[PDB]
UniProtKB/TrEMBL annotation, chains A, C, E:
In natural infection, inactive HA is matured into HA1 and HA2 outside the cell by one or more trypsin-like, arginine-specific endoprotease secreted by the bronchial epithelial cells. One identified protease that may be involved in this process is secreted in lungs by club cells. Palmitoylated. It is found in: Host apical cell membrane; Virion membrane. One of its GO terms (molecular function) is host cell surface receptor binding. The chain holds residues 18 to 339 of 566 of the full protein. This is Hemagglutinin.
From TrEMBL, chains B, D, F:
Binds to sialic acid-containing receptors on the cell surface, bringing about the attachment of the virus particle to the cell. This attachment induces virion internalization of about two third of the virus particles through clathrin-dependent endocytosis and about one third through a clathrin- and caveolin-independent pathway. Plays a major role in the determination of host range restriction and virulence. Class I viral fusion protein. Homotrimer of disulfide-linked HA1-HA2. Interacts with human CACNA1C. Belongs to the influenza viruses hemagglutinin family. It is found in: Host apical cell membrane. This is Hemagglutinin. The lineage of its organism: Viruses, Riboviria, Orthornavirae, Negarnaviricota, Polyploviricotina. It comes from the Viruses.
Length: 324, 160, 324, 160, 324, 160
């Protein structure tokens, strides 16, 4: 009669590495690295992402004519830009503190767009219909940004304008505007009469003055002139005042922002899809319990810690010695 | 093996044993077969389970982490930001692989230690009533029947 | 006769966790995590901290009328701001590179305040007594910053002023000043006569020109105008020159700084107290030898490494099996 | 136990022993009691002391570390700065807990190993002059008096 | 007959530390920490480094008169500045976004310097020979930057100039220029006639206007006036246009850059030497296979990971117990 | 020693042995000397080699890493950049020393375990044909000649 003491073994092929030996077959192990995604852009918190498509944040906020599709969107789980998001500022110029605005939008889950300065009633003494350009076309015809209003002189007169807005939206209000710069003093006069105009913008915390900078610059989209874009976040209860004797591209629509942490902007060519997830990456959604993933470092929602690893298997059983 | 048991003085494993990681074979008159040692196997399962959970606990969840843009005159901070992302990325990849690499060694040694102890336990139970053949087998002197084998397993046996 | 080999055991209840097992009672252990403080703001190096109280760095350096208490303080172990440090720039305006100045002050352990441009002798040709405003009151009456001098025209004349200062303090000298911006050209003339004034400041390394920006802005503390604040650190031996034809809020007092690493600014509501410590945190002082602490990440002096841990106990003895 | 001694073949501890971590009981004619093995206990104390000090050495002291302010148009660097603070904070918290967690295991095994070795040492000293009862006890054959017990302890004993 | 089982031992004195015990003599070990360098600045990729010597990036790019030595250099493995690199802007002024330019140069392995605006043919209507100053001397005589051209009026006339350049170098082109600021309106007229001049620079993406800022500033190198320096990277195919009615320090030479990652600028007093290496540090070159080094954190090429360690020896053999 | 062998029940090393880390002495009639146990020594060399390589693998190569300049109004980012450089510098120095410190302990225990196992292996080979003297020596009963010793080494011996 005999009694032996031994240990388990099986047909497992699982392998793990150790300090002293590589490729050791084990009886049981757990993979800690997630490496699969559905290659689709899904919704988080049951809300679809905002697909800017051919437009970029600039084109969206300013209202580039090629972004009308986005006009009715006002809430999203995250913003998506693509490798072909080129429609931004159709009229050549500098967008001041643009990256900063993008950073700001990263914590905005939605807004209430409103006509801060109604077009048909806010400018009794200035023309509001000739503000179009071939640089910002729509349906082949000259047009302009949907959220700004290019004001020009009325009957050879551009009186000092003064327009203010008091914020009672109970939240931050994003106000955008522009300053135009004709290529010649002749154009400066055709558009605004006043040779030496200025634009002035101010609130309790914002204060800035702008001067036309007349000069011909290399043409871009047919324009030798330039148009600079500005923005500011007006606080609840504060007031913003615009004063100008020419060159002001006035705000038309503005946005009352709703903050809602846990969001951002991502660049992806992955297709949006009727689907849900708790974790989203530029390549597609992850659906896993594993502590790690090597899909992508950029992530949105509840996800596994990104890591450059190719393999991360932890041994649970023992060395497998079937000796068959 | 660090403890000389697994893949050591007990050369191989039993594909036959299928109720645990550690067990006995036994070849009595009444018959043969295999039997797993719950006491052992369970304490091991608990320990390993607690180990894997402890590892996962130490690693944090990745929440919303998106890039940032920089204009043409912010190359220095663009790089600083890049140096920070790669920086922590390399740190955590290091931590994850190194932790797993080191614990795999510890886990295997753990099993080796368990087999070893199960043996020594059984050994000091039988004492003179059997001899050490090798390969972790004990050849009895006083013909051990089925209920006799069982007594060795549950550590009751008891017989000077 | 018998001889047994055994191990210690006792009435210890200490517990520690391990990879394989949680909550293991041990015979001996050492706690490595410090989690106690005295909830008081004490002095380091035998020097009291500078409690700005209701004022903030701006109010302190400019000399806001509500910060007279700080006037006689010129050395500190660390600066303290509270959740109620609101008295800063009583006159609405932008404080340029303000955060930077704060960063600069973080390595200043003391200074020698001095009247760089004596009020009663540096401006023979400009008025030095009408520079007050209801925005910066004191004792109910209109007043102004203690460390600046608001210069206005004298008998309907504001001659080009030119004032220079050579630094022989043998150390950096912090010079602060302002540029005023009336809401209307009428006020521009009442205050400075010259419609088109300018302020010019320069040293061997600093060089900047300022232009009045006339415009009505939303009123803040009753002011539709604005006042911008500037500063610079004049190096030993260098010279700073001020030239202006109006709108200059001249320096009155300046500071010769003494650097002394190992200090900073903290925000706290903890009360200052007659007490000493080698380690200070916004919640209170630490007095420990332990390698760690989970009191606060912000620290001043010699302190334990901050960590998010709740427990950090290291086993020294062995598993405690009293089997009573 | 990794070495099968503590909480293993020597089931419990002696609240009675109070001069060290490892020791002997002994039940001679002249009387009973407990006695700690200095040699062992001290080498352990030295090692553990050196271990704790080594851990503390690896962790650095926290000096003046205060925040920074950023204006409304520096949200990107404010976040970069925040990402860096949380970054190292999580790294060090990880390092501190993981180090302690892992060394606690090693420390317990260390003690287990020490008890185990003390036994085997005593065992090979007595050889034939006594038998292994279990629970780490040796029952003598040649009545071992008080000064005889002591000889086993200080490793002098010596008697084929 | 006896058979014993033992272990190796030798005359080794190697020591290593462990958690439980310090200074343990071992039979075999490997040092992982490299701590030796040749104290020399060698070439990488078989290319010599650019030793600016007494000049700094500014002096090099602008062409300070004391940096003629660098004129013929157009490719390098890395740039070297010394503790005595003081020759930069000989004419007092501000160099805008200077650090940024330095950062840009860090990935430039070489360039093709060319005369973007030939001196003897680009300015028919302005003087091109009186643009020298005692602040930028050469051979005791007044001189100026080699890569810029200080234009002044011709026969009491300074017509509006307009000069453009189209980039066909098939790569980025670094264009540098300056804006002069006389100390008095008298000098403003002696130099440029026009009292109210302006300088205008533009491309598809760059757009900026400059105004003379007349004022006497503390003299630096004899100058009470100032000269600000600007630059921009003109993209392939783009056009840069300069327009001015005075005060423009025109570009003379520009640089077509060649990017070539894996390089940078370092500060060192180590001597350049006819030698090669795959790893370079400010103290000297490293030539090692070891995973670590404690020579210097700044490194160029293939190097061991820097670390603050003094010793890093890993035990391979066993505890050495010779018991002699 | 963690396994009680090296510097334990086998007090010292043999400067005489010079073909490996582990070996036998042997004192037969025909003569004495030393002989290294290839099987053992090699498996150890492989393991240690694999260990050192694995450590080096985890550490990355330092490529071009140069400083950045900041003007007088960029002290905040200059410091942020400095906090990041020192940050990772302290992390990696920590990782490098701590890794080496901990593996040195493991390596020494590894050797200790190997000596221990070589002994137990030899021991169960000889069984009754010799006695355990101590210091890891076996005194034979049946006079073991040169080719007899060799049989013990290559594990052939075999003789109940
Ligand atoms: C309104 C506007 O911006 N127009 C252009 C359009 O002409 C062009 O084809 C497109 C893609 O290049 O970008 C913009 O949409
Ligand atoms: C000199 C000055 O700044 N005065 C105001 C004071 O009137 C106000 O009550 C306080 C807090 O609201 O802020 C400032 O101290
Ligand atoms: C300030 C404080 O409360 N610290 C005291 C310290 O002064 C004193 O020397 C020590 C003596 O036990 O106790 C605490 O450490
Ligand atoms: C022209 C120029 O900027 N070079 C200067 C030179 O004028 C000066 O005399 C010397 C001493 O500091 O340093 C540089 O060589
Ligand atoms: C050659 C020249 O320009 N002379 C100056 C000299 O007067 C001055 O003392 C020195 C240090 O600043 O720099 C230059 O050498
Ligand atoms: C037609 C027009 O509007 N101009 C360009 C056109 O040259 C280009 O082909 C097109 C597609 O990239 O993008 C437009 O912006
Ligand atoms: C998003 C997805 O496809 N993953 C699914 C999840 O939706 C579902 O709620 C869960 C239930 O077990 O199983 C996951 O695999
Ligand atoms: C009298 C005075 O100057 N202090 C006012 C105080 O009355 C008011 O409640 C508070 C509201 O913010 O603003 C302070 O400036
Ligand atoms: C720069 C130097 O002298 N070091 C050389 C190195 O270039 C060479 O790769 C190595 C092995 O070939 O030998 C070193 O001595």
């Amino acid at each position: 009669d005999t009694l032996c003491i031994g240990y388990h073994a099986n047909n497992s092929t699982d392998t793990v590495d150790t300090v002293l030996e590589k490729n050791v077959t084990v009886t049981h192990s757990v993979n800690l690295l997630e490496d699969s995604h559905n290659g689709k852009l899904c919704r988080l918190g049951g809300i679809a992402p905002l697909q800017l498509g051919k437009c970029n944040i600039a084109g969206w906020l300013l209202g580039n004519p090629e972004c009308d599709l986005l006009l009715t969107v006002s809430s999203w789980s995250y913003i998506v830009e693509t490798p072909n998001s080129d429609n931004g500022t159709c009229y050549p110029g500098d967008f001041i503190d643009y990256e900063e605005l993008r950073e700001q939008l990263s914590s905005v889950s939605s807004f209430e767009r409103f006509e801060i300065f109604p077009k048909t009633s806010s400018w009794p003494n200035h023309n509001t219909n000739k503000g179009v350009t071939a640089a910002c076309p729509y349906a082949g015809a000259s047009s302009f940004y949907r959220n700004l209003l290019w004001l020009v002189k009325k009957g050879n007169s551009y009186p000092k304008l003064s327009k203010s807005y008091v914020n009672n939206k109970g939240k931050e209000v994003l106000v955008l505007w522009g300053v135009h710069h004709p290529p010649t003093s002749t154009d400066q006069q055709n558009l605004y009469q006043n040779a030496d105009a200025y634009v002035s913008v101010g609130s309790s915390k914002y204060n800035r003055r702008f001067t036309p900078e007349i000069a011909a610059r290399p043409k871009v989209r047919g324009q030798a002139g330039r148009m600079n874009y500005y923005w500011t976040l007006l606080e609840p209860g504060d007031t913003i005042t615009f004063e100008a004797t020419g060159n002001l591209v006035a705000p038309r629509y503005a946005f009352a922002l709703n903050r809602g942490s846990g969001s951002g902007i991502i660049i992806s060519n992955a297709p949006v899809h009727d689907c849900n997830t708790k974790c989203q990456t530029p390549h597609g959604a992850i659906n896993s319990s594993l502590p790690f993933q090597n899909i992508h470092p950029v992530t949105i929602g509840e996800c596994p810690k990104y890591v450059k690893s190719t393999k991360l298997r932890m041994a649970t059983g023992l060395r497998n010695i079937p000796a068959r | 093996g660090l403890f000389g048991a697994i893949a050591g003085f007990i050369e191989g494993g039993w594909t036959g044993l299928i109720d645990g990681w550690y067990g006995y074979h036994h070849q009595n008159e009444q018959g043969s077969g295999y039997a797993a040692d719950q006491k052992s196997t369970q304490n091991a399962i608990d320990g390993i389970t607690n180990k894997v959970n402890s590892v996962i606990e130490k690693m944090n969840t990745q929440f919303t982490a998106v890039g940032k843009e920089f204009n043409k005159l912010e190359k220095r901070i663009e790089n600083l930001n890049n140096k920070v992302d790669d920086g922590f990325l390399d740190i955590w990849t290091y931590n994850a692989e190194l932790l797993v690499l080191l614990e795999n060694e510890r886990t295997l040694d753990f099993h080796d230690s368990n087999v070893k102890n199960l043996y020594e336990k059984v050994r000091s139970q039988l004492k003179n009533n059997a001899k050490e053949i090798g390969n972790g087998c004990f050849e009895f002197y006083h013909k051990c029947d089925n209920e006799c084998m069982e007594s060795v397993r549950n550590g009751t046996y008891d017989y000077p």
